[PDB]
Amino acid sequence: ESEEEARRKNWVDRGWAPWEEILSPEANFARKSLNEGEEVALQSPEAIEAFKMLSPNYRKKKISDMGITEDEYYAKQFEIKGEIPEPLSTMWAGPLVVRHVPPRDWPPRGWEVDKKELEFIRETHKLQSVRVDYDKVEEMVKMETDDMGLDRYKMFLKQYNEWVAANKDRLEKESYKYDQDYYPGRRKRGKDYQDGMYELPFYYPGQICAGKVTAIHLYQGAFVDIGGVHDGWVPIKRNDWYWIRHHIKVGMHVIVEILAKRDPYRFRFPIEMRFIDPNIDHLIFNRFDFAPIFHRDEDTNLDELRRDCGRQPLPRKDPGVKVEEEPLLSNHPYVDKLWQIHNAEQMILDDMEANPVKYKGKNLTELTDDEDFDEENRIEYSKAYYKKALLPKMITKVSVKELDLEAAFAERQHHNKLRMEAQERGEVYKIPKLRRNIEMDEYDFIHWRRSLEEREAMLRDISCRRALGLPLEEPGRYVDPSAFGKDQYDPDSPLYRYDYWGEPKNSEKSKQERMTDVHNKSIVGKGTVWYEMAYEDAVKERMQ
């Protein structure tokens, strides 16, 4: 495209700016001379001027001729070049009618104050909602002081003096512990902490204040000291400074307004302000989407950090399944422990039968296999014994008191009595289910009831939300369907799957040789199956 459009695009997107290059004499001579050519007599005036300026005596002669001092010539090099903006003039819209209200977040988290006095302090909040006619203000002003009523604010001042006298050293200790070095936007400590400064709870967004600029940062912005341990912050980004540097300078006294007050621990700049007095808003184009925060060592869960700093949730790939239409969950978590304790009870009860002498002399209710038995030592991996397959054998040691052997003993007595009775009859005795299995089924049933109630409420919630337009999924959690590219998933959409030229080569990956081999070892004759049916269907046919 054109050079103008390209330069505009650079300035807008990439942050280009014609920053002043403070070159050395040799660098300036190199930049001026190379334009003409190599080993050619210099004819440009600036090239010959730089060639003469390569000598210190010529520079001294030029300084003496111009009449400026050496200190002035040193500063002439550090001079902004190009178009210079016109000086900005402050304009006031009208009379500024103000109030002194206590902040809304005065009570610090973890500090106790009088409730009756707190109500008198907070009563100003309802009074602040009264309109005043600004045009007729001057007609009603009274020049007699000592009659103003600020009892609520004075009591707030007393309560704040109490808190600061209590917690000054504690705040300084916490700042020294958490923060190693001082930075604009941090608590002033050590020599910088002169007494009489206003703490952070003293401020509140909406209060007009006045201060002087103390630091100017290119990327972060401008910092204004408003008489407190924490300076103020005005967000000014990289590219706007090229034009804002002629209106905002260090040591200038400005009027600022507090927009948001935050926490120093979780935010680099607790208070964010705007420049009412300079009014540089026409100039600012690059904005901050989210406030700067501290990523500290204590933070180990990114989701907690995102919730604390107010940022959106971590992006995740969006599953294509619909939560409304899905199979319910009936499996119970306690089912595994109930099954394992059932097996342990059955085994110990059957083994007490094999050793009647061991069972004799010891009550079924009170028994101890090992005194130092622990569940932690029980968990282990063992793959030494392998009949067909080798895998780690997880070991679980049920506790002695965990098993209630009296019920198992009575159950087994009744069961073997009925077994021998049915053998006298001439038929094998069969029992449908034991007690603990029925209890596990009841656990599964109550879990299924919980899941069913959850889904039934979810259907109504879907409707309600949809009716009222509220979103169904958490905004920001499922964002990118495909947006992140170069993701290898073998889906044949980015052409990551094997070429569809026949796919005859499978020895490298997904080789089905071992499965066919073990199937031929199990069943050599792969004849057409005369009877093919599901397991549950076969079990039901056996039942029905």
Partner 1 sequence: RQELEFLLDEEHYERKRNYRPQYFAENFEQTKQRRDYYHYTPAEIAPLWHDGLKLLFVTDGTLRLHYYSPSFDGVVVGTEDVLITPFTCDRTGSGDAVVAGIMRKLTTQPEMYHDQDVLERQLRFAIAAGIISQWTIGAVRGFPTESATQNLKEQVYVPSMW
Partner 2 sequence: VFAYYGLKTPPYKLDALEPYMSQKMLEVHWGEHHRSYVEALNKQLEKNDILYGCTMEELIKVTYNNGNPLPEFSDAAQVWNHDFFWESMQPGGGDMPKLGLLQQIEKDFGSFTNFREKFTEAALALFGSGWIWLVLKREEKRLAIVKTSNAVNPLVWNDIPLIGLDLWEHAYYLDYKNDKAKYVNVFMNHLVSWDAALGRMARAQAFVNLGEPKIPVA
Partner 3 sequence: DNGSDCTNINPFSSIYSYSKAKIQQSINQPQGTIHTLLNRNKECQSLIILSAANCSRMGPFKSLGPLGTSLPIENFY
- Contact window for partner 3 (CB under 8 A) among 33-41, 56-64, 210-218, 514-522: 210-218
The Cα–Cα gap between 437 and 340 comes to: 11
Out of 185, 211, 235, 264, the residue judged to bind partner 3 by CB under 8 A? 211
225 binds partner 3 (CB under 8 A): yes
The Cα–Cα gap between 230 and 232 comes to: 7
Question: In 3D, which of 185, 461, 473, 469 has the Cα closest to residue 312?
Answer: 473
20 binds partner 2 (CB under 8 A): no
Out of 90, 128, 312, 413, the residue judged to bind partner 3 by CB under 8 A? 128
Write out the binding residues for partner 2, residues 453-512 only, by CB under 8 A. Answer: 468-471, 474-476
The Cα–Cα gap between 176 and 227 comes to: 20
Q: How far apart are the first and last CA of the chain?
A: 82
Is residue 500 packed enough to be buried (19+ CB in 10 Å), middle (13-18) or exposed (0-12)?
exposed
In this structure, are strands 232-235 and 253-261 parallel, antiparallel, or unpaired? unpaired
For the CB of residue 229, give the shortest distance to partner 3 in the complex, in Å. 13
447 strand-pairing partners: none
What does 138 interact with, of partner 2, partner 3, partner 1, none (CB < 5 to 8 A by kind)? none
For tokens 């799957």, name the residue.
Answer: 497
The Cα–Cα gap between 181 and 199 comes to: 19
3-state secondary structure of 383: coil
What does 203 interact with, of partner 1, partner 2, partner 3, none (CB < 5 to 8 A by kind)? partner 3
265 binds partner 1 (CB under 8 A): no
Q: Which residues contact 316 (CB under 8 A, 6 or more apart)?
A: 477, 478, 479
Phi then psi dihedrals of residue 65, to 5 deg: -70, -45
What does 498 interact with, of partner 3, partner 1, partner 2, none (CB < 5 to 8 A by kind)? none
Out of 120, 183, 243, 448, the residue judged to bind partner 1 by CB under 8 A? 183
Out of 79, 83, 144, 513, the residue judged to bind partner 2 by CB under 8 A? 83
What does 183 interact with, of partner 1, partner 3, partner 2, none (CB < 5 to 8 A by kind)? partner 1
How many residues in the chain?
Answer: 544
- Nearest-Å Rg of the Cα atoms of the chain is 41
| Residue 398 structure tokens | 């049920």
Is residue 203 packed enough to be buried (19+ CB in 10 Å), middle (13-18) or exposed (0-12)?
buried
Task: Name the residue nearer to partner 3 (CB basis): 336 or 442.
Answer: 336
Most distant CA atoms of the chain, gap in Å: 135
| Residue 442 structure tokens | 């009841």
Out of 70, 105, 369, 404, the residue judged to bind partner 2 by CB under 8 A? 105
180 binds partner 1 (CB under 8 A): yes
Out of 1, 21, 133, 424, the residue judged to bind partner 3 by CB under 8 A? 133
The answer to whether 213 and 222 have CB atoms below 8 angstroms apart is yes
Out of 208, 410, 518, 538, the residue judged to bind partner 3 by CB under 8 A? 208
Out of 4, 181, 508, 532, the residue judged to bind partner 1 by CB under 8 A? 181
What does 123 interact with, of partner 1, partner 2, partner 3, none (CB < 5 to 8 A by kind)? partner 2
Task: Name the residue nearer to partner 1 (CB basis): 183 or 478.
Answer: 183
For the CB of residue 212, give the shortest distance to partner 1 in the complex, in Å. 22
297 binds partner 3 (CB under 8 A): yes
49 CB-side CA count, 13 A: 7
148 binds partner 2 (CB under 8 A): no
Out of 176, 193, 285, 445, the residue judged to bind partner 2 by CB under 8 A? 285
Task: Name the residue nearer to partner 3 (CB basis): 115 or 486.
Answer: 486
Task: Name the residue nearer to partner 1 (CB basis): 198 or 265.
Answer: 265
- Contact window for partner 1 (CB under 8 A) among 73-81, 118-126, 177-185, 323-331: 177-185
| Angle between helix 45-53 and helix 25-33 axes, rounded to 10 deg | 150
**Integer angstrom CA distances of residue 528 from 522, 532, 534:** 15, 10, 16
- The dihedral region occupied by 143, where left means phi > 0, alpha psi between -120 and 50, and beta the remainder, is alpha
Beta strand extents in 262-373 (DSSP E only): 271-275
480 binds partner 3 (CB under 8 A): no
Using CB under 8 A as the criterion, what x/- string covers residues 263-282 for binding partner 2? -----------x------xx
The binding site for partner 3 (CB under 8 A) comprises 13-15, 96-101, 128-135, 198, 202-204, 206-212, 219, 225-227, 238, 258, 286, 295, 297, 300, 379-381
The binding site for partner 2 (CB under 8 A) comprises 4, 7-8, 11-12, 18, 82-83, 103-107, 119, 122-123, 125-131, 205-206, 239-240, 242-243, 260, 274, 281-282, 284-285, 287, 312, 468-471, 474-476
